[PDB]
Design a protein around this ligand. Structure first.
Ligand SMILES: *[C@@H]1O[C@H](CO)[C@@H](O[C@@H]2O[C@H](CO)[C@@H](O)[C@H](O)[C@H]2NC(C)=O)[C@H](O)[C@H]1NC(C)=O
Ligand SMILES: *[C@@H]1O[C@H](CO)[C@@H](O[C@@H]2O[C@H](CO)[C@@H](O)[C@H](O)[C@H]2NC(C)=O)[C@H](O)[C@H]1NC(C)=O
Ligand SMILES: *[C@@H]1O[C@H](CO)[C@@H](O[C@@H]2O[C@H](CO)[C@@H](O)[C@H](O)[C@H]2NC(C)=O)[C@H](O)[C@H]1NC(C)=O
Ligand SMILES: *[C@@H]1O[C@H](CO)[C@@H](O[C@@H]2O[C@H](CO)[C@@H](O)[C@H](O)[C@H]2NC(C)=O)[C@H](O)[C@H]1NC(C)=O
Ligand SMILES: *[C@@H]1O[C@H](CO)[C@@H](O[C@@H]2O[C@H](CO)[C@@H](O)[C@H](O)[C@H]2NC(C)=O)[C@H](O)[C@H]1NC(C)=O
Ligand SMILES: *[C@@H]1O[C@H](CO)[C@@H](O[C@@H]2O[C@H](CO)[C@@H](O)[C@H](O)[C@H]2NC(C)=O)[C@H](O)[C@H]1NC(C)=O
Ligand SMILES: *[C@@H]1O[C@H](CO)[C@@H](O[C@@H]2O[C@H](CO)[C@@H](O)[C@H](O)[C@H]2NC(C)=O)[C@H](O)[C@H]1NC(C)=O
Ligand SMILES: *[C@@H]1O[C@H](CO)[C@@H](O)[C@H](O)[C@H]1NC(C)=O
Ligand SMILES: *[C@@H]1O[C@H](CO)[C@@H](O)[C@H](O)[C@H]1NC(C)=O
Ligand SMILES: *[C@@H]1O[C@H](CO)[C@@H](O)[C@H](O)[C@H]1NC(C)=O
Ligand SMILES: *[C@@H]1O[C@H](CO)[C@@H](O)[C@H](O)[C@H]1NC(C)=O
Ligand SMILES: *[C@@H]1O[C@H](CO)[C@@H](O)[C@H](O)[C@H]1NC(C)=O
Ligand SMILES: *[C@@H]1O[C@H](CO)[C@@H](O)[C@H](O)[C@H]1NC(C)=O
Ligand SMILES: *[C@@H]1O[C@H](CO)[C@@H](O)[C@H](O)[C@H]1NC(C)=O
Ligand SMILES: *[C@@H]1O[C@H](CO)[C@@H](O)[C@H](O)[C@H]1NC(C)=O
Ligand SMILES: *[C@@H]1O[C@H](CO)[C@@H](O)[C@H](O)[C@H]1NC(C)=O
Ligand SMILES: *[C@@H]1O[C@H](CO)[C@@H](O)[C@H](O)[C@H]1NC(C)=O
Ligand SMILES: *[C@@H]1O[C@H](CO)[C@@H](O)[C@H](O)[C@H]1NC(C)=O
Ligand SMILES: *[C@@H]1O[C@H](CO)[C@@H](O)[C@H](O)[C@H]1NC(C)=O
Ligand SMILES: *[C@@H]1O[C@H](CO)[C@@H](O)[C@H](O)[C@H]1NC(C)=O
Ligand SMILES: *[C@@H]1O[C@H](CO)[C@@H](O)[C@H](O)[C@H]1NC(C)=O
Ligand SMILES: *[C@@H]1O[C@H](CO)[C@@H](O)[C@H](O)[C@H]1NC(C)=O
Ligand SMILES: *[C@@H]1O[C@H](CO)[C@@H](O)[C@H](O)[C@H]1NC(C)=O
Lengths: 121, 440, 41
């Protein structure tokens, strides 16, 4: 139940601890400051990705991008109940930049226009 | 079916990473980290990670390099306010000491005198003091060692050299993983892994050919090296039992001091009270005999059956690697380890002679040197061996025998014995998943 | 063997230089350019 205690759990079970994990993400004087400044910058960059996706208000969100299952031939029960997040991250390591690009371009660009059109009238 | 991309934040996934670690200590002046660091967490936390097989590799561990640079910079800061001895490079005429002496190699201790400056630019004084042979080179006329190679700085006498434990703690967004598996050889997957906010305290103990005052193996002697088949590589051996070291300097030396210039003072060895005797360190014969037998058994597992294993003294190199260095009371000792390695294996105490040197260069840097102030009175020092550094004379395929000799000369190898347990990782909270869902 | 330059441009000079030990001095000589040296010979 502690930090990274979920590492051995299944991906579904691990979802219970997401909030706990979030709380822990946030001459020698120069070295110490560089570590702290970078920790802040890295945190903010991840928040920006969520802000573009519109997911920044939640730990969990859905998107309008289809899964394209040919990326990995597995069932949902095979993924969620029989595998860890550590293993999963390796399975899709070659598709991560693709998925992020799809979310920023294929979803946000359509949503902002439809919302503006409703606002205009 | 109709699967969709979803996004999760706070996901418990980590990647290998390197970052600055924050020094802390549980700890009046000392050369060590207590002046450069902050208090530790009084109750460190640990979380076991179930079903985790995370790989460790001590030979690639960047924490070793980070500690090295912090230790060197830390040590140098202690000499910045201290006295310069540049005025002392002089003709330095000397003669042999005559006294009630059991001595050592003849000429080991000398009675020297020189023309030295005073508080005033207009005046000089005649002084005399004792020096060890190791610090004096013949030009009779003499020069101090390194008078033609480097400036010499006197360490401040008020500053302690006694080791103080150092802890390292992760910055936010990072975590330190620890291998708990017993009999780990420092590489490959670790069967039991846990996460800690900070490391256990590590003392900066400096020694050669033997590892002192470190951690012990939990059950049995562990032998590890970067490449067990490569004779060039140092072999670290961690003992599962302690072996003590008892060192002493019986001579009752005295200390005198003279002011030099307006801002500086010099400390030197005065007359020695009572009989003059050789400095020495004891090693238990019975304890060492058992210790070697355990090491040999483990070596056979790595080097095969029915190989005759022998030990020997180093064939060459500088005093720094051919002898065992100590720092006791701030005095620097070099001891001849022969008789500890004088054995062949097929199937009450030892006294080692020691020598004292006042001019040292702990980090083997060219152009640097330090003069220790002499310590008044009799010194006794008790410490223990927690491991050995060995190298092979082998690599030959033409023999049924093998021989080992002591290694050393690289301080980083000592720290590996405490840091092999730890790895640093970065936490990456963002990830995605296929689960079917809908949104507006 | 001199084809020279502006006359006096190169100079042959000598002095008492200090040594490794505080107790001793050494005699040396060296060449200087006229621009490097000013008369106070
Ligand atoms: C102090 O006494 C020792 C012993 O007499 C001197 O060492 C000897 O030096 C001579 C002359 O070169 C040698 O022939 C001997 O073999 C040395 N004896 C040894 C090594 O036992 C030493 O030189 C003296 N020190 C001074 C500064 O005079
Ligand atoms: C500083 O002085 C020492 C002593 O004179 C020098 O070491 C000698 O180097 C020569 C080279 O001919 C040898 O023949 C000697 O055996 C050396 N003497 C000793 C006592 O080892 C040293 O070279 C000088 N400076 C440096 C940088 O080495
Ligand atoms: C620590 O032990 C492991 C085995 O538990 C060693 O792993 C070896 O890796 C090499 C890679 O080529 C294999 O060929 C070996 O078969 C593995 N083990 C054995 C017994 O052969 C690992 O190298 C060891 N680490 C050290 C520093 O010796
Ligand atoms: C070693 O030398 C010290 C002095 O450097 C001796 O200490 C002296 O002990 C006598 C005992 O009567 C005192 O009167 C002196 O005042 C002490 N001197 C000091 C404190 O500087 C010590 O006893 C000697 N040890 C021996 C002879 O075993
Ligand atoms: C290390 O062992 C040696 C040998 O037992 C000790 O030497 C003896 O020391 C006592 C004084 O403590 C003397 O009275 C004996 O005469 C010594 N025996 C000799 C010289 O053969 C030595 O003291 C031990 N060192 C320590 C620190 O205990
Ligand atoms: C430690 O002492 C031993 C002697 O006890 C030194 O070795 C001797 O070296 C000579 C010359 O090669 C040999 O003839 C001797 O047989 C060696 N030991 C003997 C004879 O017992 C050794 O060099 C010393 N170590 C250091 C670092 O000085
Ligand atoms: C290894 O650790 C021991 C125990 O701390 C050290 O022995 C202590 O040394 C200090 C400093 O001289 C003394 O104040 C203590 O009283 C000693 N403890 C004893 C004698 O039980 C030993 O010096 C250490 N070794 C090294 C090389 O630092
Ligand atoms: C799965 O996605 C890849 C791109 O990552 C695409 O080239 C492939 O055609 C996709 N399969 C489909 C859409 O059936
Ligand atoms: C996934 O499992 C379900 C039952 O939970 C099954 O009906 C379905 O065919 C599976 N999908 C596959 C194998 O692609
Ligand atoms: C879970 O995955 C393992 C391999 O990691 C596989 O051997 C096993 O059959 C899976 N269990 C299921 C699908 O119930
Ligand atoms: C992803 O790339 C790695 C090499 O970086 C490769 O070994 C792996 O098979 C790739 N995964 C897929 C699904 O192609
Ligand atoms: C492995 O994960 C399971 C998840 O239920 C857990 O019960 C188990 O304790 C973990 N490891 C071990 C050794 O049990
Ligand atoms: C050596 O011992 C004798 C006899 O105790 C003593 O008289 C003498 O002072 C001691 N040493 C010297 C240099 O006199
Ligand atoms: C100090 O200088 C004087 C005068 O030159 C000289 O007589 C004396 O021997 C010198 N002392 C030493 C120790 O060199
Ligand atoms: C050890 O060195 C030998 C030299 O032949 C090499 O063949 C071997 O791969 C090395 N083992 C390692 C790097 O684990
Ligand atoms: C130190 O002396 C003790 C007894 O007081 C002995 O047990 C131990 O072996 C000695 N340590 C050495 C010789 O390194
Ligand atoms: C050194 O020689 C001088 C000569 O006067 C003597 O007075 C002094 O006691 C000697 N020092 C030692 C330690 O013998
Ligand atoms: C060590 O002790 C054993 C008996 O336990 C003895 O046979 C051996 O000779 C001793 N030392 C050496 C170097 O053999
Ligand atoms: C030698 O081989 C035997 C088995 O034949 C084994 O029991 C023994 O432990 C081996 N000796 C070693 C590895 O030193
Ligand atoms: C070292 O071993 C050799 C060979 O057995 C022996 O001759 C020599 O006396 C030994 N040295 C000591 C100090 O025991
Ligand atoms: C070895 O020396 C250290 C010095 O701190 C001490 O703490 C430890 O208990 C000693 N081990 C023994 C005596 O077995
Ligand atoms: C300089 O000139 C003279 C003749 O005037 C000649 O003998 C001498 O060798 C020359 N020196 C050289 C060329 O180095
Ligand atoms: C060194 O100084 C002395 C002082 O008498 C002087 O006579 C000599 O010429 C000088 N040597 C030089 C300048 O090379």
């Amino acid at each position: 139940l502690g930090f990274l205690g979920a590492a051995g759990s299944t991906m579904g079970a691990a979802s219970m601890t997401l909030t706990v994990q979030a709380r822990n993400l946030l001459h020698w004087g120069i070295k110490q400051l560089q570590a702290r400044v970078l920790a802040v910058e890295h945190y903010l960059r991840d928040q920006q990705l969520l802000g573009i996706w519109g997911c920044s208000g939640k730990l969990i969100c859905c998107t309008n991008v289809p899964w394209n299952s040919s990326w990995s031939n597995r069932n949902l029960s095979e993924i969620w109940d029989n595998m860890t997040w550590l293993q999963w991250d390796k399975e899709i390591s070659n598709y991560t930049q693709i998925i992020y690009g799809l979310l920023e371009e294929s979803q946000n660009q359509q949503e902002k226009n439809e919302q503006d059109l409703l606002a205009l009238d | 079916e109709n699967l969709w991309v979803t996004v999760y934040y706070g996901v418990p996934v980590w990647k290998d990473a390197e970052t600055t670690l924050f020094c802390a200590s549980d700890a009046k002046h000392n050369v060590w980290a207590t002046h450069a660091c902050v208090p530790t967490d009084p109750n460190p936390q640990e979380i076991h990670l179930e079903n985790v097989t995370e790989e460790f590799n001590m030979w690639k561990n960047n924490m070793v390099e980070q500690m090295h640079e912090d230790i060197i910079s830390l040590w140098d800061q202690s000499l910045k306010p201290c006295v310069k001895l540049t005025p002392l490079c002089v003709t330095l005429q000397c003669t042999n000491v005559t006294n009630n002496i059991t001595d050592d190699m003849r000429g080991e201790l000398k009675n020297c005198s020189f023309n030295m400056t005073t508080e005033l630019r207009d005046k000089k004084q005649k002084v005399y003091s004792l020096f060890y042979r190791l610090d004096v080179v013949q030009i009779k006329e003499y020069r101090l060692i390194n008078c033609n190679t480097s400036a010499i700085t006197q360490a401040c006498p008020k500053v302690s050299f006694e080791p103080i434990p150092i802890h390292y703690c992760a910055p936010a967004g990072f975590a330190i993983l620890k291998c708990k598996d017993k009999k780990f050889n420092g590489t490959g997957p670790c069967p039991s892994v846990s996460t800690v906010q900070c490391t256990h305290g590590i003392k900066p103990v400096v020694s050669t050919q033997l590892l002192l005052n470190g951690s012990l193996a939990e059950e049995e002697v562990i032998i590890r090296s970067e490449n067990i088949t490569n004779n060039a590589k140092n072999i670290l051996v961690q003992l599962n039992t302690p072996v003590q070291i008892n060192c002493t300097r019986p001579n009752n030396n005295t200390v005198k001091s003279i002011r030099i210039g307006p801002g500086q003072a010099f400390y030197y060895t005065g007359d020695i009270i009572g009989d003059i005797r050789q400095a020495h360190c004891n090693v238990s014969k019975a304890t060492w005999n058992e210790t070697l037998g355990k090491v040999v058994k483990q070596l056979r597992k790595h080097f095969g059956n029915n190989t005759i294993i022998r030990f020997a003294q180093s064939s060459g190199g500088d005093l720094e690697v051919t002898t065992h260095s100590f720092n006791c009371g701030g005095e620097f000792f070099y001891c001849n380890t022969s008789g500890l390695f004088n054995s062949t294996w097929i199937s009450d105490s030892i006294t080692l002679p020691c020598r004292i040197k006042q001019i040292i260069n702990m980090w083997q840097r060219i152009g640097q040197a330090m003069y220790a102030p002499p310590i008044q009175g009799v010194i006794r020092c008790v410490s223990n061996i927690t491991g050995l550094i060995l190298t092979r004379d082998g690599g030959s395929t033409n023999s049924t025998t093998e021989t080992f000799r002591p290694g050393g000369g690289d301080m980083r190898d000592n720290w590996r014995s405490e840091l092999y347990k730890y790895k640093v990782v970065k936490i990456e909270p963002l990830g995605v998943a296929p689960t079917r869902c809908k949104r507006r």
